[PDB]
Amino acid sequence: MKTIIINGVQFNTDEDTTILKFARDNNIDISALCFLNNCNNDINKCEICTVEVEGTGLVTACDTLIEDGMIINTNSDAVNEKIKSRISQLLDIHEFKCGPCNRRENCEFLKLVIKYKARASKPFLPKDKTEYVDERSKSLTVDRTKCLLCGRCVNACGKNTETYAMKFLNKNGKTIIGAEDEKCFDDTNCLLCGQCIIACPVAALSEKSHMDRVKNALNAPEKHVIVAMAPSVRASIGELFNMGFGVDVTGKIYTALRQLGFDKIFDINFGADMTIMEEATELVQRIENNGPFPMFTSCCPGWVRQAENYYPELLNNLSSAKSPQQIFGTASKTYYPSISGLDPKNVFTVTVMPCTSKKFEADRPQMEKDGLRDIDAVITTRELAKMIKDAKIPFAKLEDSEADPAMGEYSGAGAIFGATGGVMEAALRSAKDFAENAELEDIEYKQVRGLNGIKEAEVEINNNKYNVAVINGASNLFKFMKSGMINEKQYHFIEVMACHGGCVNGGGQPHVNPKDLEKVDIKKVRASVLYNQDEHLSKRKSHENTALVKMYQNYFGKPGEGRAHEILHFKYKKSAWSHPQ
Numbered sequence: 001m002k003t004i005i006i007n008g009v010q011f012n013t014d015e016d017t018t019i020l021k022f023a024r025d026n027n028i029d030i031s032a033l034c035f036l037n038n039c040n041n042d043i044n045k046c047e048i049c050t051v052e053v054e055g056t057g058l059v060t061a062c063d064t065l066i067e068d069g070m071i072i073n074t075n076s077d078a079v080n081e082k083i084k085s086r087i088s089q090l091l092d093i094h095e096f097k098c099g100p101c102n103r104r105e106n107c108e109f110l111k112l113v114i115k116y117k118a119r120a121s122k123p124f125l126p127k128d129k130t131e132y133v134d135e136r137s138k139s140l141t142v143d144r145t146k147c148l149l150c151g152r153c154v155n156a157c158g159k160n161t162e163t164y165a166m167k168f169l170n171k172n173g174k175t176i177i178g179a180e181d182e183k184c185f186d187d188t189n190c191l192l193c194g195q196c197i198i199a200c201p202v203a204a205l206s207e208k209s210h211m212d213r214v215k216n217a218l219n220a221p222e223k224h225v226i227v228a229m230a231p232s233v234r235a236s237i238g239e240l241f242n243m244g245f246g247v248d249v250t251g252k253i254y255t256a257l258r259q260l261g262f263d264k265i266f267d268i269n270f271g272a273d274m275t276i277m278e279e280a281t282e283l284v285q286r287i288e289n290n291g292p293f294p295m296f297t298s299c300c301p302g303w304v305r306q307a308e309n310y311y312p313e314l315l316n317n318l319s320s321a322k323s324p325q326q327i328f329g330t331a332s333k334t335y336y337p338s339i340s341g342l343d344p345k346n347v348f349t350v351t352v353m354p355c356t357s358k359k360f361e362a363d364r365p366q367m368e369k370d371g372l373r374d375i376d377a378v379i380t381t382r383e384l385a386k387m388i389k390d391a392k393i394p395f396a397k398l399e400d401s402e403a404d405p406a407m408g409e410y411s412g413a414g415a416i417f418g419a420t421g422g423v424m425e426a427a428l429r430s431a432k433d434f435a436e437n438a439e440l441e442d443i444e445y446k447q448v449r450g451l452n453g454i455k456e457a458e459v460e461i462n463n464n465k466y467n468v469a470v471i472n473g474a475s476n477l478f479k480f481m482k483s484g485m486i487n488e489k490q491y492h493f494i495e496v497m498a499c500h501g502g503c504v505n506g507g508g509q510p511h512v513n514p515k516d517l518e519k520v521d522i523k524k525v526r527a528s529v530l531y532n533q534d535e536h537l538s539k540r541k542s543h544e545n546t547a548l549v550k551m552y553q554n555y556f557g558k559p560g561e562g563r564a565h566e567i568l569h570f571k572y573k574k575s576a577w578s579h580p581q
């Protein structure tokens, strides 16, 4: 037991925790900035969490454990003057121009500036931003006129991926954040997962914009612009319209997309059902041939980059099915003209993703056929919200509409893709039916769901027991491989997601402030929307999707062979040998 006094209030406690956590647990306001993910910036503490401890002086609450006898003051003039001073020193290195800024509505730094009425000693007003901006990547952008050097991106990359692809760099005697040797992120071991963006409290890290690609296509007379959103968008975008967390906004999105001028409203969940058709067929092929094993999923481009960069010997074990994004895109240039009369060259296919790595996937040289890209543009959840707001579309008051069905219907198995273990569960629902030539009623695989980092299960398919794993976050892939877990038993099918929680926690998603993250389990609440859709959909197996069945019957043929394999599959170039690299 300890006795603590905070702002005159005595507490008796046996907790072993920091001042900051104890105070917040007890409804005592203490500000913080660089603290996130249970880490602060050890080499450059922001000190926004400063408090006074009698007999010690000023201390950082976010990294100081409570101790018996402490008498703490969080709101004295001296404490508040120190905090204001720290914010002022940050304004000295910050281009404070919120009007056109992409974080204007949800910036953590602006909130602190306002709270403490802080002002720079000397305004930072660079007349030209070229030297501060890196837009080389297909997925990420850096604007160092906004960077606080808070280290939250560095810490978050370490925690989420263990790549440490985001680093502190010494650029002629000045500290910046960036990739190894100040290279373009894409040319390093970076996965392009954008977890560093999600951790950034300001507009310093962003997605590489595709909004101009999209607007130019919408305004081109002869382009027919398809749009299709990822599973997770419908569970997330409402947050950016003050609608709260866990709101299913599917119908409003379809309406908003029509109001933005898109010419066809499809859904990547249809592509999710296509990927299952192919992937479950491939798994059954491997089961009936008793190998090869394991098969890894290939639908998360952060994981694909992780394999290319660290485990290229596993590229030969990846499923060859394209991801829902790319498989949908391929079909949008082949099947869709065949049922519409559109000239394939005039089709422009746009996805809305919770993900920055998806932009790199869509821009891979070989992701095209006959000169036509599978996918022409990828906008994040954040970018779609901005497009809606710029168009003055009253999202929260829109009536619901439906997708155009031909490439827009989806089953409950497709619906769950955006949660960790969703691909696994969806794939098993079809694989078991295929292998057993049956229509099984027991389709829920709750043992692969949820936030555990490594989830294993034994499944019975056609009288044989098989082992599956769901790897939940890139750091957990490293743990599974480096610890030898892959060799502890024979795995047959392994799902890997780069973002912990699955795509509902992707790097293109709405930012959430640290206080809301403590109040709301964002990964669970966003995923709950998707599981709810599956629960109430009539068709809960990808192979029961009626639009999909017609597509295969009339155009692609049998999945997993022939035309479907020729067109809808992809093997990574780095799977084969080359030297040098």
Ligand code: SF4
Binding pocket: 094, 095, 096, 097, 098, 101, 102, 103, 104, 105, 107, 108, 109, 110, 146, 202, 203, 204
């Ligand atoms: S990052 Fe925040 S404080 Fe800085 S200009 Fe943008 S909104 Fe304003």
Ligand code: SF4
Binding pocket: 146, 147, 148, 149, 150, 151, 152, 153, 154, 177, 199, 200, 201, 202, 204, 205
């Ligand atoms: S890019 Fe963002 S998270 Fe990273 S140090 Fe700069 S302000 Fe902090």
Ligand code: SF4
Binding pocket: 140, 156, 157, 158, 160, 161, 163, 164, 165, 166, 185, 189, 190, 191, 192, 193, 194, 195, 196, 197
């Ligand atoms: S995109 Fe992912 S791997 Fe690359 S620096 Fe950001 S968090 Fe690290």
Ligand code: SF4
Binding pocket: 192, 193, 299, 300, 301, 302, 303, 354, 355, 356, 357, 358, 497, 498, 499, 502, 503, 504, 505, 506, 507
């Ligand atoms: S888990 Fe989803 S959001 Fe994250 S990198 Fe992979 S595809 Fe993108």
Ligand code: FES
Binding pocket: 031, 032, 033, 034, 035, 040, 041, 045, 046, 047, 048, 049, 050, 060, 061, 062, 063
């Ligand atoms: S929030 Fe405590 S040092 Fe930054």
Ligand SMILES: [Cl-]
Binding pocket: 404, 405, 406, 407
């Ligand atoms: Cl249609």
Ligand SMILES: [Mg+2]
Binding pocket: 039, 040, 041, 042, 063
């Ligand atoms: Mg620390």
Ligand SMILES: [Mg+2]
Binding pocket: 043, 044, 045
């Ligand atoms: Mg220092």
Ligand SMILES: [Mg+2]
Binding pocket: 217, 218, 219, 220, 221, 223, 225, 261
């Ligand atoms: Mg148009």
Ligand SMILES: [Mg+2]
Binding pocket: 319, 320, 321, 565, 569
């Ligand atoms: Mg193949």
